[PDB]
Write a protein that binds this ligand. Structure first.
Ligand SMILES: CC(C)[C@H](Nc1ncnc2[nH]c(C3=CCOC3)cc12)c1ccc2c(c1)S(=O)(=O)CCC2
Length: 169
C-alpha cells in the first residue's frame, strides 16, 4: 500500500521515529519521498548516501552526476528533487551542515525547511554521524522546523533510546 510505515513511535503530530536502516525502510514502505543526507556535489561515497546509492545499483550516482553537470553544486542548507529509483517515487537530496568540516550549525534549520515542500517523507537525522552535529540538537531542530509528516529512521538502538528519552524529558 501507500506510505505503509510500521513500528514508529509518534513524538509530535507530525514527527515519528524508528530504530531502523533507512534503506530497508525505503524497500518495505515504498515512500513517496526518501531524503538523502547529501553533500553539495552529490557524491554518494559512504554513510547514508552511499547505502541508498548502492541499493539503486549506482543509478542514483549517474543521475546525480548529470544533474550537477547541468545545474552546478547545491548550497549547504539546500536541496534538489531527483528520481527515487526502486526506493521511492522521489529522492529529496538535502545538504545539512558538516560541522566537522567547519560549516555553520545554523544552516541545519534551512536544511530541514526543505522537507516542508513534501507532504510525507522518510528521512535520516540530518547532520548526525560523521557530519558532527549533536544528534539531540538535530532532532529538536526537526521537531521545531518540519510541519509536514516526517518518519525518521535512526539505524542505532543506543542513539534511538537516547533521542526518545531526551524528547520525553
Ligand atoms: C546517526 C547514524 C546512526 C545515522 N545512520 C543511519 N541512519 C539511518 N539509516 C542508516 N543506514 C545506514 C547504512 C550504512 C551502511 O548500510 C546502511 C546508516 C544509517 C546517520 C544519520 C545521518 C548521517 C549519517 C549517519 S552519516 O552517514 O554518518 C553522515 C550524513 C548524516
Amino acid at each position: 500500500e501507500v506510505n505503509s510505515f510500521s513500528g514508529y513511535l509518534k513524538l509530535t503530530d507530525n514527527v515519528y521515529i524508528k530504530n531502523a536502516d533507512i534503506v530497508e525502510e525505503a524497500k518495505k514502505v515504498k515512500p513517496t519521498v526518501v531524503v538523502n543526507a547529501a553533500n553539495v556535489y552529490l557524491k554518494h561515497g559512504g554513510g547514508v548516501a552511499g547505502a541508498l546509492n548502492k541499493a539503486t545499483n549506482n543509478a542514483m550516482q549517474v543521475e546525480s552526476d548529470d544533474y550537477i553537470a547541468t545545474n552546478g553544486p547545491l548550497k549547504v542548507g539546500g536541496s534538489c528533487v531527483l528520481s527515487g529509483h526502486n526506493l521511492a517515487k522521489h529522492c529529496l537530496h538535502v545538504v545539512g551542515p558538516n560541522v566537522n568540516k567547519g560549516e555553520d550549525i545554523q544552516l541545519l534549520k534551512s536544511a530541514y525547511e526543505n522537507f516542508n515542500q513534501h507532504e510525507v517523507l522518510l528521512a535520516p537525522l540530518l547532520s548526525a554521524g560523521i557530519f558532527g552535529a549533536d544528534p539531540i540538537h538535530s532532532l529538536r531542530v526537526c521537531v521545531d522546523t518540519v510541519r509536514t509528516n516526517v518518519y525518521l529512521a535512526v539505524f542505532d538502538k543506543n542513539l534511538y533510546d537516547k533521542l526518545v528519552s531526551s524528547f520525553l524529558e
